[PDB]
C-alpha cells in the first residue's frame with residue numbers, strides 16, 4: 396500500500412481513541428515522570444509510547460505496514476497496565492481505550508489482506 400492509503404485506513408482507529416473523554420486524556424502526551432512526581436516510571440517502562448507520538452508517526456508516513464502501528468498502540472497500553480495499579484484510574488482508562496481500539500482495529504485489519 397501507498398503511505399497515504401495505509402494512513403487513511405488506520406486514521407479512524409486513532410481518532411476513535413482521541414474521541415474517548417476522559418479516558419484518552421492521560422494518553423495524549425508522553426508520560427512526564429518529573430512533572431507527575433513519579434520518579435520510578437522510567438525504571439519500569441523502558442520503551443514509552445503515547446497518542447501524540449503515534450499521531451506524529453502516522454502523519455509522517457512512518458507506519459509502513461499495519462502491524463507496526465498496532466504494535467505501538469499495544470505498547471502504549473501495555474506500558475500503562477505494567478506501571479499503574481489495577482485499581483487506579485489510569486489502568487481503568489487504559490482498559491476502556493483498549494476495548495475501543497479492538498472494536499475499531501479488528502474491522503480495519505479484516506479489510507486488509
Ligand SMILES: Cc1noc(C)c1-c1ccc2c(c1)ncn2Cc1ccc(Cl)cc1
Nearest residue numbers: 417420421422425426427474475478479485
Ligand atoms: C498514561 C500513563 N501511564 O502511566 C502514567 C503514570 C500515565 C499518566 C498518568 C497521568 C497523566 C499522564 C500520564 N499524563 C498526564 N497526566 C495527568 C492527568 C491525569 C488524569 C487525567 Cl483525566 C488527565 C491528565
